[PDB]
Amino acid sequence: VDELLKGELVPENLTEDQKKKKKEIMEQESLWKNPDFKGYNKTFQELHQLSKTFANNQFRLALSNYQSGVNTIMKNRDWVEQYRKEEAEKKRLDEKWYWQKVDRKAREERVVYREKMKAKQDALNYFSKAINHLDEIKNPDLRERPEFKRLLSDVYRSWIMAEYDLQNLPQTIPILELYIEIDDNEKEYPAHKYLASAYSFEENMIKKTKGPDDMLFKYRYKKNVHLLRATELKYGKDSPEYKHIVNVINRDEVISV
Amino acid sequence: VDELLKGELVPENLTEDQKKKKKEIMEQESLWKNPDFKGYNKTFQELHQLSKTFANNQFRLALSNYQSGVNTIMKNRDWVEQYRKEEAEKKRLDEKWYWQKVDRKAREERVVYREKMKAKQDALNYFSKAINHLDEIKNPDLRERPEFKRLLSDVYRSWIMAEYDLQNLPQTIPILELYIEIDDNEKEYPAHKYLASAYSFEENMIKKTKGPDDMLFKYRYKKNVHLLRATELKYGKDSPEYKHIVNVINRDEVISV
Amino acid sequence: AALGLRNPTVLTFISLSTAGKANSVIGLCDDALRVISKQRADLGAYYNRMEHAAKG
Amino acid sequence: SEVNKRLRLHTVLFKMKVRTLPHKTVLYKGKPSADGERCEAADKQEAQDNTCLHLEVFDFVGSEDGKSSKNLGAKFKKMELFFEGSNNADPDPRKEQPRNLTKIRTYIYQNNFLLEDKVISVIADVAPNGEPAHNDKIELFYQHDDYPVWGTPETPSEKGVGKYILSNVENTKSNPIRNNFKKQFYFKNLDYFDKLFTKIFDYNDRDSNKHYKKNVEALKGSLKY
């Protein structure tokens, strides 16, 4: 069941009465046909944003960027694999000591990490524009279609994974809570795994900067809940992993006796 | 069967239909004759590297270096034989002690060893240039011809023999492994004798510098594998010499009882 | 690489870890100084000429 | 032109799964719907019952001025190929004989939001093979600004408006409408779609060898210890 098979949100092409109604309106537009008309009042013209034609172009605008953003992620991995293969296939005629191998190995790792960060930034820019376009569709009905929820989650997912590598953990928390509200994305442990790692960073900053205890408990409480849910989705209840996490959470959290 | 008898990689000059295609393309370039043309984008021009004439020039470039580099080894041996001959022919009119002869003898051995290390480096420079020319051919079809495998193995063999004279054992390991994967070169015992020594040198340095045991086990294992393989290819299996090496390897390695 | 203290192909520089090697590095560093001195001679030569041209 | 023959060789895509597609391109397999005008998506794309290839390429209005994100409109050109009969029994798409072409359909769409100019051009050739000159079997549907309604034929009093056939169009020396339509537009429209089908097939075909190489490459990793 590929929602993105056709690459569109709502198809465009039946009542006899409506057919006559659409015909007489077309007569009026022929009388007032003025391609140079520019409405001083923008309210009437903006009603076109509620039409299916406007939403069809916005969906493909996001799809155009989503293809570009994911490609740069994939094209980088192609270059990452090729670069490792290329270096192992060239001859080191000025290398005889073990530390020289480590010195050469260090430079190769610097280049890979340097290029990966450049690729994660380019992909984030493309995914950022996709999020903007998918949020300017003002018709709630066109948002509930399976095609929309399929692309919306995909745009959110690849944006969070790319952003998280940029060490921008606090930024991903609001987006992740939007991801787990789309159909059955809540039943994914990776979504709760990222939230547990992201909320732990926020707790450290409050402790490091000696912030209020109220924000310390709130960021701590969200960490355990999303960590506990992540374990259950992957290992289930009454398992050796789940029992271990409860002791860690119970030890960390506050209990009243 | 001399692969390098003709001094080329692949000979170059049929179908009338193919002969007709070559006619129209050749006439197309007649109109667009411009020797001063320089392509801004090199991708189209870089495809010339796949042409047969490109490989013929690369092969004869590498072949030219091999002849010069091998000449350095041969000329050095000719002079060393000549230099030693002249030394015994000149009259020592001011020598009447045994210790004087030893000092005079030590002078010649210093001069000869001085010239050899000079000759090997000059030869090693040429063999390095030959290697680079062979590695800039990107046609796998032309990489399996008898002419190609003859020169690639001959260059490596003369390169490693020159490298080992300069006490550069650790550099020989990557070249040796690529040598034993061409035609039936793995059947040669000398190619396994140098592998035995090279992995023994790396065994000492890791032990001397108190490095990880993981690199020690890997280099020790490679030494025993190729030390035993070399004896098997020369003195044969189930031979008294082969029995002796099994005693050393079992003594040197780790056995779990 | 240009001064002769490094091999443009092998890419290995001079080493002193041997008594015999160190005796051969004295000779190389002498010709290394000759090239640096030769280059500074030309830069000084142009500068004096450029000085005269500006005055004229 | 022998171009229509080359569209027959593209019947291997029914048994070939589609995984790599060019930028802003849509392709799927399906079966004819009511009236055989178009294609309809199928729950399974690997089913041999399918006979329709639907290749769609979409762009954005104003991309020449760098104003794609301004949301000036939408446009896409798609070609649907219709075949007859079921496919071969073997599930291997590498070996497959060319199949005859029932009809070649061309679809053009362009909507300008600011100018409210919507143009829909549909071209269907129901006899792709059999005769070089079959102008009478080329339906030309030309709708402008939702006029005329879909399916309305061309009246003699209003020539060129609505569905008609290329035989009605004049091809005089003074007004070579047919010559310009074929030499400039129609031939290149077929060529653009023909290359795209081969390009998509070659990309997905090539991916098969890599996964076999991956297992071979991983097996070579056992020789290091």
UniProtKB/TrEMBL annotation, chains A, B:
Keywords: Signal. This is Uncharacterized protein. It comes from the Bacteria.
UniProtKB/TrEMBL annotation, chain C:
Belongs to the bacterial flagellin family. It is found in: Periplasmic flagellum; Periplasm. The chain holds residues 171 to 226 of 282 of the full protein. The lineage of its organism: Bacteria, Pseudomonadati, Spirochaetota, Spirochaetia, Leptospirales. Component of the core of the flagella. It comes from Leptospira biflexa serovar Patoc (strain Patoc 1 / ATCC 23582 / Paris). It comes from the Bacteria. This is Flagellin.
UniProtKB/TrEMBL annotation, chain D:
Keywords: Signal. It comes from the Bacteria. This is Uncharacterized protein.
